[PDB]
Amino acid sequence: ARAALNQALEMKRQGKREKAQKLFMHALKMDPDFVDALTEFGIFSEEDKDIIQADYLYTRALTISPYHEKALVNRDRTLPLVEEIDQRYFSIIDSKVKKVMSSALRRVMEETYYHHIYHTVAIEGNTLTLSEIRHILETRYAVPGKSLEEQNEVIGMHAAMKYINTTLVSRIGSVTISDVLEIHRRVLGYVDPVEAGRFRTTQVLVGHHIPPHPQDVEKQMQEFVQWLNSEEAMNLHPVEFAALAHYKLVYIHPFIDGNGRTSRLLMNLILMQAGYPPITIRKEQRSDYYHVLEAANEGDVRPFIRFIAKCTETTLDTLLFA
Amino acid sequence: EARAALNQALEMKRQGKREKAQKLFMHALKMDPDFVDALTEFGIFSEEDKDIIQADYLYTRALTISPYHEKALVNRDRTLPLVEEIDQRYFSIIDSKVKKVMSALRRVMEETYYHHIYHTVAIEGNTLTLSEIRHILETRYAVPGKSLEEQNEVIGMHAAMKYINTTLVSRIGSVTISDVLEIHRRVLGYVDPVEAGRFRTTQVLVGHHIPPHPQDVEKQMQEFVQWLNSEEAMNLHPVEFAALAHYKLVYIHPFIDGNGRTSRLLMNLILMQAGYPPITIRKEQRSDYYHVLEAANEGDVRPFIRFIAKCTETTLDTLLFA
Ligand SMILES: Nc1ncnc2c1ncn2[C@@H]1O[C@H](COP(=O)(O)CP(=O)(O)OP(=O)(O)O)[C@@H](O)[C@H]1O
Ligand SMILES: Nc1ncnc2c1ncn2[C@@H]1O[C@H](COP(=O)(O)CP(=O)(O)OP(=O)(O)O)[C@@H](O)[C@H]1O
Ligand SMILES: [Mg+2]
Ligand SMILES: [Mg+2]
């Protein structure tokens, strides 16, 4: 553990950049609570112009050891700088949403609907293609050679988003626990009608994450709905609120299945309510998406907020091609 | 040409013209089914061809319209006890066969499971074949060229009957409103998860039948469950209780869809609880099944009880082939 850090620091001296980067990663793979590695890797990353990652490391170091002097002097400088960097990116997104606020766009909107389904289902392991999804939703006929469950995941999504767009989007008032159960009722209804629209009865594992016990789900969902209809959350930038709402639901994991799908849809509800286009996390982005969700469980929700913001920009860029 | 047909039918009956009179009598009742004089005349005519059961139905129909019609009374006062004994004897013939039914049989039981689904779905209009149903339930893969809704009807049935057999069949105690909503939850869950497991909110028409208003469904369902757990129903022969339970549910029509399917399964619940094999109303029997259900709405539940009893015998006969 300490052997790797002393080796990484020596490699950093005079040359050997990629030899040190993998050595630093090794010392943190050995022990991610290595206060000395975190600050060293943080100071190292700041040299390659990555202040955001550096600050993450100094921050991770401080939660472990609050009076570590090297982490403090560094963090006392990055904290305000990183907050401005984040705030600037949000203004860049706002300028693009101002541009999107004003036949070619209609052809993009209809295909991105079928596309959103493709990615939201594929990210969970759905082997279906975009042409098969486009067929299933248009003919209502079964795609030959593919399982019923996979095609029922697709119908379920469609029923969920047609529900949000007709009932929920434009609706005035506070978001309730019944609304979330109603989205889940459609998401999972064609795959598991017994568990669709109802709270988890058993205890589950999501990677290395153990969600609240089924006995406490109802209470934690009550607090979450209350936070959605609170003014602290209402004061956040739309992208930050939408990412936090998504993380919090996913964290509670109130359902046996369809947590990620319901969250991604609740995220789009938050966005669209504040006049933002619906957003799509791609099949290819899965590995990064699970990495940033892990980083939030560990204590820092910021990388996930930036991930959701990179997605909002890539969705706003794709629309501005026409 | 109402009384004109009856006077013509009676003349045709004199000396000869049997089939000319039978269609003439049917015409007079197609013109007016509340023709007290046609009903008694057709009743006296049918008794000549050895059909006492149909005759009694007619004399009974005549008496509900006109209670003091002398010709209908003298005839009914003779058929009522005779027809009750005829019915009671058929029930004893069924009991003797259930006593007989109490590797070759195992091969019949497994195929009749897939068969029961084929008929219960086809009777509602499902274009799927027995080989396609056998595929869907074994591979869980979609049948090419057929709609998703039709295959989801099949999965739904299977979930419903696996539920009844594991939870409900052997269960000791009273049958509740929650049990019926739980069967419906599976029956219709893969086709309409929003309406599956819940009572009708709108008013519907079933042929010429207008079921109770959605406001009264809950009260009528409360009375029905109470009748299932009552001792008057408990004193009836198993076949008569199972047929009455099926008619009463179907009459209330508490669901937008899957009433016939839930009833047919509740019927099998009643039968199996009293040690009878599960019963199958065939695709081909549809026209007779809807005829006898109409006859009950009109005031006489007996033809439907005999229909369900003919089904129980044909199911007991098929088992005794091995
Ligand atoms: N490390 C982690 N900690 C917490 N939540 C995580 C996580 N990694 C993934 N998740 C979330 O949990 C979802 C996967 O959870 P699972 O229990 O595997 C099935 P699921 O709820 O059916 O998700 P789905 O709707 O994407 O299919 C992801 O889509 C994501 O939103
Ligand atoms: N004249 C009648 N009066 C009352 N019920 C009748 C009837 N004719 C038919 N039925 C019952 O009502 C069912 C058909 O009702 P519908 O409203 O058409 C659709 P359903 O409930 O989805 O039936 P399903 O499960 O057979 O598909 C029949 O299967 C039968 O059990
Ligand atoms: Mg899943
Ligand atoms: Mg039908």
Residue numbers in the entry:
A (entry chain G): 106 to 207, 213 to 432
B (entry chain A): 105 to 206, 213 to 432
From the paper:
Here we describe the first crystal structure of a eukaryotic HYPE encompassing the two TPR-motifs, an α-helical linker, and the FIC domain of the human protein.
The structure of HYPE E234G with the nonhydrolysable ATP analog, APCPP, shows a different position of the α-phosphate that would be incompatible with catalysis, suggesting that APCPP is not a physiological ATP mimic in this case. However, the basal activity of the wild-type HYPE is probably lower when compared to the E234G variant. A Mg2+ ion is visible in the E234G variant of HYPE; it bridges the α- and β-phosphates and is coordinated by the conserved Asp367 side chain.
